[PDB]
């Protein structure tokens, strides 16, 4: 129960991280807008990155639920 309780907290933290990271990536886009080839490659990278975070964001929630159920 101690570990399961820890699992819940750990998962929650991860979700928070992904939230902040998602916020930071958005801030990065603002500055990117503020070389065409370089910026183009960047824009795609953050686009691809964004998608990655969302999926991982879903996983974090999914795990948190698992941890909740596992208790």
């Amino acid at each position: 129960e101690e570990l399961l309780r820890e699992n819940i907290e750990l998962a929650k933290e991860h979700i928070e991280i992904m939230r902040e990271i998602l916020e930071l990536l958005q801030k990065m886009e603002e500055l990117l807008e503020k070389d065409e080839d370089v910026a183009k490659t960047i824009k795609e990278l953050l686009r691809r990155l964004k998608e990655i975070i969302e999926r991982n964001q879903r996983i974090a929630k999914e795990h948190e639920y698992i941890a909740r159920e596992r208790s």
Binding site: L45, R48, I52, I53, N56, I59, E62, H63, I66
Partner: peptide
């Protein structure tokens, strides 16, 4: 849970490299 963590591990590596 174990499967998801494997996947999530894959993601963080891909993200970090990006």
């Amino acid at each position: 849970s174990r499967r998801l963590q494997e996947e999530s591990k894959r993601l963080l590596d891909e993200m970090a490299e990006i």
